From a paper:
The clinical success of PD-1/PD-L1 immune checkpoint targeting antibodies in cancer is followed by efforts to develop small molecule inhibitors with better penetration into solid tumors and more favorable pharmacokinetics. Here we report the crystal structure of a macrocyclic peptide inhibitor (peptide 104) in complex with PD-L1. Peptide 104 was selected for the experiments because it is a close structural analog of p101, and both macrocycles are characterized by comparable affinity. Macrocyclic peptide 104 effectively blocks PD-1/PD-L1 interaction at the cell surface.
The structure was solved by molecular replacement at 1.9 Å resolution. The macrocyclic inhibitor folds into a β-hairpin additionally stitched at the free ends by the cyclizing bond. The macrocycle binds almost perpendicular to the strands constituting the C, C’, G, and F β-sheet of the PD-L1 IgV domain, docking at its slightly concave hydrophobic surface. The macrocycle exposes a large hydrophobic patch composed of π-stacked sidechains of 104Phe1 and 104Phe3, 104Ile5, the proximal atoms of 104Arg8 and 104Phe10, which complements the relatively flat hydrophobic patch at the surface of PD-L1. The sulfur/π interaction between 104Phe3 and Met115 strengthens the binding. The sidechains of 104Ile5 and 104Phe10 dock at an adjacent shallow groove composed of sidechains Met115, Ala121, proximal atoms of Arg113, and the sidechain of Tyr123 with the most significant interactions involving alkyl-π interaction of Met115 and 104Phe10 and T-stacking of the latter residue and Tyr123 sidechain. 104Arg6 contributes two direct hydrogen bonds with the carboxyl of Asp122 and the carbonyl oxygen of Tyr123. The overlay of the structures of PD-L1 in complexes with p104 determined in this study and with PD-1 determined previously reveals that the binding sites at the surface of PD-L1 largely overlap. The structure of p104 in complex with PD-L1 determined in this study shows no indication of macrocycle bifurcation, demonstrating that such a phenomenon is characteristic either for p101 only or for the particular crystal lattice characterizing the previously reported p101 structure.
Numbering used by the authors:
A (entry chain A): 18 to 134
B (entry chain B): 0 to 13
Amino acid sequence: AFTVTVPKDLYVVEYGSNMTIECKFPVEKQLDLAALIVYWEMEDKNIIQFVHGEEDLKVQHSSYRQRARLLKDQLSLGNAALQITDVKLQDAGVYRCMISYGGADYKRITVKVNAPY
Amino acid sequence: AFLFVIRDRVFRCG
């Protein structure tokens, strides 16, 4: 039964900082990128759609253009880490990490952004 | 795209 976990389900970050939000999946021996799907979304906004070892950038909500990246050197340790640079007040909310590798699972992470001073 | 349901949340392509 394929399980996604999250070591932190709540991040409190400063406005304008960078943040990396993690979700974990099981990996063994080989990781065929051909079969791996990593999806990040928040509300109705696609952040990352990673299919065949390639981020697809046509689908990515405009608010996250040039700010959102999957850390792919991490996939091999079973880490699907979303990095967001220049955190905005609108980045606050509920994120979902979906990962498929023979069947699938998703977890929720809450981000809260402290406004300046 | 495909479309996936996990514990009553769905996920599609672009």
